[PDB]
Design a protein around this ligand. Structure first.
Ligand SMILES: N[C@@H](CCC(=O)O)C(=O)O
Ligand SMILES: N[C@@H](CCC(=O)O)C(=O)O
Ligand SMILES: N[C@@H](CCC(=O)O)C(=O)O
Ligand SMILES: N[C@@H](CCC(=O)O)C(=O)O
Lengths: 317, 319, 319, 319
């Protein structure tokens, strides 16, 4: 039988070594037939309380576990609100081709038609499947396998809230039957240049929400609070309001890296559209979203704040 | 022939006296529209929509109200940048005191480009403007052969000609080479049915939007407050959930008489009452089924006549 | 408390005397619905929805008409297999002579499955049935926290719990843990406004559906004619286009007096008039904004009182 | 410069000696493409794609194989009607023996139309064809700034310029004013990795497609057998489910040696094995994650070298 470790970052979504994982095995007994399961409790929080502190603890533990010859994969149970950020962080920091699968539930385990039992069962099948190797970190939700780079929560409440709006799911898992149709051609995991092994605190990056009649005071507060980066979630193709642009140009010149994303929800924030990124000293985040752009920029800042090197990071990953 | 005014907020959305050089160039570009209606033209502003302000919204709304109050004028078409068309559309949808059609239209590609989308978008927008079924549909955005309710429309994509969507409801109808069909209509009050009146307003109240993430801060809430925010939209994580440090700052905002409304960063779905956030104890409003940029517009209008949490919840549970 | 009848067409969609053992088993598995309504139950048929027939359709619409004409009855819920729920819903949408709510609900996973969707679907569906705002919304499908107008609804996916969609218009409403909110209503006539009356109809006119592709054939048109087709829905390539050989057979079918209606295989959008097919000259109808299976239901009802091409086109341009 | 041959299967998709007047017109309508590549032209056929036949598919795939085997030729672009582009694209995906880019492109609006999509579509296709990362992506469809895998691609709308989608996976990349980006690639074997070889084929096996509904028939299955069908695609209700009368006729079809492949009318998702239909007992094949019309293309290619149910199941579970 494959050996798999479930890492819990909160409560149950439905002795292994963590009571929470013990309860998962009670709630979804069919998973004990598929893999030998060990449990750890990494954190015990809603995903909306997540911190760089917990990300770095999680990423270092996943790297430890996947260096062990007996461990074939890791599953992480995680609140849905920020699963896309943790997943994306791990996609660039996990130095392995062994599967890492992130799974949660849009309804609590006690609700009518709770989604968490099917999700967990499907997650374990994805984690043990031979094809899941070198697919990078994935989110498994609602019978779908989404690449960490592309995946996002699109909906506030729906069981089908996870989507890959720029590329679509790479695979399906239906009552445990795992099929891949595509794979990411952007480098992840073992091919990643990032290494957080001796990082104990991630660079501060704020995200600003653009609109008509915008301000500079939020740009200015981010600077005063020690922002090493700012993601601008711009209007349409990453366009800022003029007062804000002026503040962001000053930000960039003081050596705080400014990366242009968009508020819209999908598509690329492109270079050489209406914003002279080279002249203003900005980075175009291209086909990401503000919250994943933030993760990539934090990782960039562990080893450079050069506009050109960071543009190349956003155009590569 | 039906009498229609085209109000330009910016450059030409097609090509490259009706009373404005921008509209004379639209008519030269898409001569078919001259056969559909007697077009008059005015330049309201001279800006890309990323430069839009409350000042321009107020000028634009008052002018639309004056034009539709004229017996002879049957509709207004507004040519607008795509980036913030959804905000302008939602603003007029709650301030325009008339059932006559108001149609916003723009171009995802410049007029000069290969396969410019502006000519079809404008030609279609004219047909929607003059169609009898467009009466009391509220303000609409006509883009890519689709008619979207102002309440529900958003730019969902950075570059695509199909970048406009109604994620919570779908388009209310279609317009294909001029042929106009409606399949649905909004049951949320708009236009004539709206309680809001900006005829006597010269400056709209300040409302900030904050983007939520893990490891969030209180220093943008405190900066919003210090710049005299009357309202704050919180673009929360998932179902409008804040980071703990941030909720603490917003609680202090809400007690100090600044209205905090919870929306979401995700893209779609309702930011609901009676979920993980205790709005009644913390002093917050839930925006429910809008998005942070349109929730900003509704809170600005709410703040023109009340800062009361209960009244403002009722506004967001109505419009 | 509201009085609602659940009509079961098959087995239980939830779990593993109201009047029908199937509905008693629903009430046992989902006891929270019993504080919402006084439930009566009847068994109309005992089949998977892939075994549905015109005979069951007529039995169902007649019984719903009787039930909703009772002063004691506020609404009807029909538990239905998912495969053909859209056809039954659309039939009832044009045959039910009431504004009282009619809700179709099913389950994409069986009741005995992990994370069964039936219990929530059914709970949500009762809340929609008893909601005041559901009056005169027409027959609706309630699946995966969504209210879909019968005209617009389709199963779009083989297996997903979110398989139901309204691809031309979107959901008319949400239901979330029983909280019902409508955002739109269909502007196409339904239920009490429909010209159709099946009360005296014991068998529906025969309508066949054909799947278009390159290197297509005339033999299936010919077999449909040979079996006594009164109408044929052509699921065309792109905007309802036939292969030349097929179009020649359809021309003959139409001249013999069999009604030929052009639909499309693609999934969404209008099969339009005045496109590449000369419908007038060849004697064809364009089905416009439907899909082949719903076009079939509307043609079947159209044939209960005309086979006139111009009359039927008006029917497809109306409903 | 790179050398690219444009193959025309119909009229100009843009405007209103490379070696073909159609391609000469394309180059004059979009002179931008002369800077990007040395373009040669051929007229393979002159038809609307709704008139495509296996004879044209074989002529086209054989000429693509000749052109890409030349050391001077870097890529092939094929202008094609949108209606059946997914079928031809898919056929070439399994029959082209090269890793060199093959790109299909068309237009949802005629070249003479306001906001014609053809010029940009063609310009973007030439950029995808000459891009280094286009190597070994399989045959692609370039439409509306998107690069779709031939395996995954379909026309989803009758009219919209954004009609092309990959509902099971999404686009594998973007092309925006010529700038090419891939984000994924198919992990299903294609082009040079495919086991199919049509170099010694003259006529593709006959495969029909049947459209499933309530009160379904056996007279179309029976007509398909009488016309010498070697394969039948069944476009089933939900997860590929037949009406009983039709199932009994398909079981007889299968026992006769006619390969029955189960697909779905719904639009997306897998028609799975070991759901409600005993495939192994009934003697049927599950087409899994395709659609009726691409499953037809795979079954026609399967039928060039086996009619064994087990071997064809493996082909559908592989390609
Ligand atoms: N919103 C909470 C609730 C649990 C969930 O939806 O996963 C979280 O993200 O942890
Ligand atoms: N960013 C410009 C571009 C024009 C457009 O896409 O509408 C604007 O919104 O005004
Ligand atoms: N395909 C069956 C199974 C149950 C269901 O999915 O509704 C039916 O439509 O009845
Ligand atoms: N139905 C025609 C129209 C052209 C097009 O839209 O591609 C064809 O497919 O050839």
């Amino acid at each position: 039988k494959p050996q798999v470790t479930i890492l819990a970052t909160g409560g149950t979504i439905a002795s292994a070594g963590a009571v929470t994982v013990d309860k998962l095995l009670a709630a979804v007994p069919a998973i004990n037939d598929l893999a030998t399961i060990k449990g750890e409790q990494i954190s015990s929080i809603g995903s909306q309380e997540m911190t760089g502190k917990v990300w770095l603890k999680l990423a270092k533990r996943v790297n430890e576990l996947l260096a062990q010859k007996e461990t074939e994969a890791v599953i992480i149970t995680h609140g849905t609100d920020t699963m896309e950020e943790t997943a994306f962080f791990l996609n660039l920091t996990v130095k392995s081709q062994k599967p890492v699968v992130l799974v949660g539930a849009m309804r609590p385990g006690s609700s009518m038609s709770a989604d968490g039992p099917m999700n967990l069962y499907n997650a374990v099948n994805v984690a043990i499947n031979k094809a899941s190797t070198n697919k990078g970190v994935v989110i498994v939700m609602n019978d779908e396998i989404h690449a960490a780079r592309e995946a996002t929560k699109l909906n506030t409440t729906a069981v089908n809230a996870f989507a890959s709006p720029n590329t679509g799911k790479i695979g399906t898992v239906y009552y445990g039957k795992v099929e891949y149709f595509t794979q990411s051609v952007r480098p992840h995991t073992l091919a990643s240049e990032f290494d957080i092994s001796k990082i104990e605190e991630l660079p501060r990056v704020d995200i600003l929400y653009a609109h008509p009649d915008d301000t500079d005071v939020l740009v200015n507060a981010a600077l005063q609070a020690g922002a090493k980066g700012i993601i601008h979630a711009g209007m349409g193709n990453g366009n800022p309001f003029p007062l804000t642009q002026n503040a962001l140009e000053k930000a960039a010149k003081s050596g705080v890296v400014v990366a242009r994303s968009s508020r819209v929800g999908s598509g690329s924030t492109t270079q050489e559209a209406e914003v002279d990124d080279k002249k203003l000293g900005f980075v175009a985040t291209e086909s990401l979203n503000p919250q994943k752009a933030r993760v990539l920029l934090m990782l960039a800042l562990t080893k450079t704040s050069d506009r050109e090197a960071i543009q190349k990071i956003f155009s590569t990953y």
